[PDB]
Amino acid sequence: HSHGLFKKLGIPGPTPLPFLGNILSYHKGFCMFDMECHKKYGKVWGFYDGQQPVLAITDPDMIKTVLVKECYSVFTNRRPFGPVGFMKSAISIAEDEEWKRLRSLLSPTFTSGKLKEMVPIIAQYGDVLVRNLRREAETGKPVTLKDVFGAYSMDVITSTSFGVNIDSLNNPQDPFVENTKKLLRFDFLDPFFLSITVFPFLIPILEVLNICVFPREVTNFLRKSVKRMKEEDTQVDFLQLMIDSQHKALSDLELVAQSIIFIFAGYETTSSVLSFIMYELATHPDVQQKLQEEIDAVLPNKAPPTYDTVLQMEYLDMVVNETLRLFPIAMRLERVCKKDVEINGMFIPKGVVVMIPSYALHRDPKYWTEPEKFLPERFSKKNKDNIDPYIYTPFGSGPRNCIGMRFALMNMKLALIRVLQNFSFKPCKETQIPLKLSLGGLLQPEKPVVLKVESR
C-alpha cells in the first residue's frame, strides 16, 4: 500500500522514503524505534515496512478490541511472512479457518493436566543442568549463560517433543542436537529479511524454487526422524499427544509442522529469558538471596521441585514477570486488518498491520513507576492489581496468544529452582553493566551475558 495512507487518514508518523518506507529507522532495532515513535507521536502512529503500512496502537481498550474482541472477525492473522514452504501449516504461520482448526486441535495438548505429566521429564534435565553447571564453576572461569541455558532449553525440547533423551552440551555432535540447534529465531533486520521487506514481490519466486526460511537440511532431517519414531510396540510427549488427536483430525504434514514450530517457538526464547533472569539476579544480589530463601523455605534441604511447589512460589513468579516486563523478547504483537473497521473511534483500513508495541508499553512512564528499573515488587500480590493486562503482554493476549505460556513458565521456573538451590550467580569484571541491547532485530544483549557461578 502507497506511502500516502497515514497522511490521508490524519495519522502521524515518521515520513517514509520511496521504496524503503521507514526501514532505515531500524538502525537501532525494533525496540528503540518503537520507544522513539511513541515519545514523539503519542498514542497511535503509522509507518511503512517497505510498501507495507503498519499502525501502532497503545490504548488498552483498543488493544483489547484487536487481540480479544475482534480476533476471529477482523484480526486473525500475523503479518504475511517470507517463503515458508510446507511450514505454512505451522500453527503460528497458519491463517483464518486453518489456524482456528489447528489451535482447537493443539489446545488439549497444552493443558495443565498434560503439563503436570511432563514435569518429571523437565525436572530430570534440571539435574543435568546442575551437574553441568557444577563443573564449569568448580573449574572457575566466567560462565556464558546462552550456552548453559541453550543446552538446557534443547534438552527439555527433545524429551518433551518425543523422548529423545540427550545431554546436549556434552553431545554437541549428535546430529539431532546439531540439527535442532539451527532452529533459532529469525533476525528480521538481517540482510535477507531486509531485502524481502523491500522486495516482497520476490517471495513467490522463492516459494517456486523451494527456497525456504527454515533451512531445508534441518526440516528434511526432522520430517525423516518423526516418520521413523512414529512407526511399534506401545508401552507422554508432544508427538504422542499429537499422534493421538489424528472438520477435525490432524494430518501427517501438519503434525511435523507443529513439531518443528514448537522447537523454533520454544528454543531461543526460553534460553534468552533464562539469561535475562540470571543477569538481573546477579546485578541485584538481594533479590537473588530473597529468591533462594523462598526456595529453601518451600523445598527444605534441596527437595525436588514439583508442579505444586513451583506454583506456590510467589517471589519466583514475581522475578520471572518483572524480567519479562523489561525483556519481552517478542518485542511486538501484530495482527493484519482483514477488513475496514472502526475501533474505539478510529478507522483502520483493510490490509494494514496493527501493531501493539509491548516493549514500549512495558517501559511507559504513564503505566510504570521508574520503568527502567528492575523491581519485582511491581508484581507482589497486593500491588499487581494496577497492572493492565493489555499493557503487560509478554505472551500476547486473546485466542491467538502464546499456546505454550504455562509450559514456558513451568520450564523456566523448574530450571531456576534447581539452579538457585545449588548455586549463586555473581558478576565478573567481564559482565557488561548496565546491560546494552543488540541493535539487530532480536531482543537480546549486545554482548553475551557471562557470570561467575559458585556452589552454595
Ligand X SMILES: CC(C)C[C@H]1C(=O)N2CCC[C@H]2[C@]2(O)O[C@](NC(=O)[C@@H]3C=C4c5cccc6[nH]c(Br)c(c56)C[C@H]4N(C)C3)(C(C)C)C(=O)N12
Contact residues toward ligand HEM (CB under 6 A) are 91-92, 103, 261-262, 265-266, 269-270, 273, 329-330, 333, 394-397, 400-404, 407-408
Between 265 and 416, CB nearer to ligand HEM: 265
Is 218 a residue that touches ligand X (CB under 6 A)? no
- The region of 73-81, 129-137, 165-173, 383-391 touching ligand X under the rule CB under 6 A is 73-81
Closest-CB residue for ligand HEM?
A: 396
423 bridge partner residues? 455
Is 362 a residue that touches ligand X (CB under 6 A)? no
User: Least CB distance from residue 322 to ligand HEM, whole Å?
Assistant: 13
Is 197 a residue that touches ligand X (CB under 6 A)? yes
394 binds, among ligand X, ligand HEM, none (CB under 5 to 8 A by kind): ligand HEM
Which residues are annotated binding-site positions for heme?
402
User: Least CB distance from residue 30 to ligand X, whole Å?
Assistant: 5
Measure the CA–CA gap between 376 and 320, rounded to whole angstroms: 8
Measure the CA–CA gap between 54 and 65, rounded to whole angstroms: 17
298 binds, among ligand X, ligand HEM, none (CB under 5 to 8 A by kind): none
Place of cell 532452529: 183
Helix (H) or strand (E) holding 177: helix 175-180
Q: Are 207 and 83 in contact (CB under 8 A)?
A: yes
408 binds, among ligand HEM, ligand X, none (CB under 5 to 8 A by kind): ligand HEM
Q: Which of 57, 66, 93, 299 binds ligand X (CB under 6 A)?
A: 93
Which residues are annotated binding-site positions?
402
143 bridge partner residues? 451
- Residue 244 CB neighbours (<10 A): 10
Between 332 and 418, CB nearer to ligand X: 332
Between 5 and 415, CB nearer to ligand HEM: 415
DSSP 69: I
Contacts 24+ apart (CB under 8 A), 345-353: 346/44, 346/62, 347/9, 348/55, 349/5, 349/9, 351/1, 351/53, 352/1, 352/5, 352/53, 352/54, 352/55, 353/49, 353/52, 353/53, 353/54, 353/55, 353/79
Is 408 a residue that touches ligand X (CB under 6 A)? no
User: Least CB distance from residue 337 to ligand X, whole Å?
Assistant: 15
Q: Are 142 and 267 in contact (CB under 8 A)?
A: no
DSSP 437: B
The amino acid that residue 413 corresponds to is K
Is 363 a residue that touches ligand X (CB under 6 A)? no
Under DSSP, is residue 203 helix (H, G, I), strand (E, B) or coil?
A: helix
Between 44 and 331, CB nearer to ligand HEM: 331
Between 62 and 331, CB nearer to ligand X: 331
Pick out residues in 122-151 that bind ligand X (CB under 6 A).
Answer: none
Which stretches of the chain bind ligand X, using CB under 6 A?
Answer: 30, 49, 78-79, 81, 92-93, 185-186, 188, 197, 261, 265, 269, 330-334
